[model samples]
Target: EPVSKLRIRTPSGEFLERRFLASNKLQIVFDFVASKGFPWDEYKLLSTFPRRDVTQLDPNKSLLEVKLFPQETLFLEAKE
Candidate 1:
């Protein structure tokens, strides 16, 4: 998919919707989350299904490259 529609489940149990070009780096998503009050230093992103830590991957990688295109559900979990 050329565009990525992301559903980020916030710690408060609400979902945040964001759309980005598939080519956008993961860092952009991180910035968006931070802009919404969730700083990367305090929170991490997790993918469903395979259950992987999106934050643990390279931020420089594009969403499409990470297979997050079309639509994806991610969770924002607070750092321990």
Candidate 2:
């Protein structure tokens, strides 16, 4: 089984660490943020490098499918 180590940077500059199965749906990650008080509609997840808006992606896609496997750092931005 493959695991993805995710580092989520919150709006307050706090880093949250979470791990998930690579096969898990992207929605799972969204739920984790929501659990920490950030609603999916209220916040957006972003990937570095190419600067992708993760929240705008299809939640049904697996993390591995989105190339978020192994390890990835994401930023949590509040909607303006």
Candidate 3:
């Protein structure tokens, strides 16, 4: 498998950053208040490759659709 490109965004619609993954799996890390439960409802998770793009996909339409929030960090894995 080839390297994949990772794009991360914040709940406020701000583009956090982009990185290149050397392996098929990419691990995302961030900071959050442990007192609060996982904030999966507040953020968004997006992953893309050279040919296939999964962002902007509807959850009802695709089982791969994901939701991420500002609470806990995200860890993602993909293949290019």
Candidate 4:
């Protein structure tokens, strides 16, 4: 399986990085669904809560700036 790198920004201006399997992106995300986990089925390829803050929120007031890469078959999901 291909390995995809996931990055998330926090509401406190922090960047988080992790890796996941490309094929199991949805399964993994659904398994760990939470406020902080990424909503894989959502049309917008963004995670939830703290992670979402980075991309959907204003950098000046928020604390995160999520940056994803290798736009392949990989998707992001939240984990504990």
Candidate 5:
């Protein structure tokens, strides 16, 4: 499986990274983020350019198709 490195930064500016298979679904990223201690039911992956909720994305698609490749920054924000 093709794996990729992801850079994620929290609202506090505490950033981190994770290695994931490129073919993995978005949900995998969700779980990993949760393991890091973010609020379980109160966050979503950051999609910029007029930001949208990436968590609402199709969990069945691979990271590649989601356009999260060649290194990208996934941000996390608490849902209001």
Candidate 6:
């Protein structure tokens, strides 16, 4: 499996720097955040400038396909 890098930042000023497999679906990241105690609906992820809400990403699609390649910094947001 091909590996990819990710820079995940939590709203609480926490960060998760981990490598992922290209074959891993974006959902896996969601699961990781959930395991950290965040709710899926209450929390959404966003990339920097030209920002996008990754929560709308196809849960079944791999991270590579979503273009979160070599590196991308995402932040977790708590919504209403």
- Candidate with top TM-score is 2
Give the candidate order by descending lDDT.
2, 1, 6, 5, 4, 3
Residue 4 in candidate 3, Cα distance off native in Å: 2.5
In order, what lDDT does every prediction score?
Answer: 0.93, 0.94, 0.31, 0.38, 0.80, 0.84
Clashing pairs in 3: 42-69, 43-68, 43-69
Clash count list over all predictions:
0, 0, 3, 6, 0, 0
Residues 1-80 of candidate 1 have per-residue lDDT tens digits of 49999999999999999899999999999899999989999999999799999988899999999999999999999999
Model 6 sits at a Cα RMSD from the real structure of 1.3
Question: Taking the tens digit of each residue's C-alpha lDDT, what string does model 5 give over 8-80?
Answer: 9888889879888888888888878888867547877787875757777887877888877657787888887
Task: Summarize candidate 4's per-residue lDDT along 11-30 as a digit string, tens digits.
Answer: 34455555655444343433
- Residue 60 Cα positional deviation in candidate 5, in Å, after optimal superposition: 1.5
RMSD (Å) per prediction? 1.1, 0.6, 11.6, 11.6, 1.7, 1.3
Instruction: Give the number of colliding residue pairs in candidate 3.
Output: 3
- In the predicted model 4, the residue pairs found to clash are 10-64, 11-63, 12-63, 13-63, 13-64, 54-64
The digit string of per-residue lDDT tens for model 6 on 30-70 reads: 88878787768889888877688888889899988988887
Native-referenced Cα lDDT, model 4: 0.38
How many residue-pair clashes does candidate 1 contain? 0
TM-score of each: 0.95, 0.97, 0.29, 0.37, 0.84, 0.88
Q: Can you write out model 3's per-residue Cα lDDT over 7-57, one digit (the tens) per residue?
A: 444444444444333331212222221112223343334443322333324
User: 13, model 3: CA deviation in Å?
Assistant: 1.2
- What residue runs in model 4 are displaced by over 4 Å at the alpha carbon? 30-80
The deviation in Å at residue 72 for candidate 2 is: 0.5
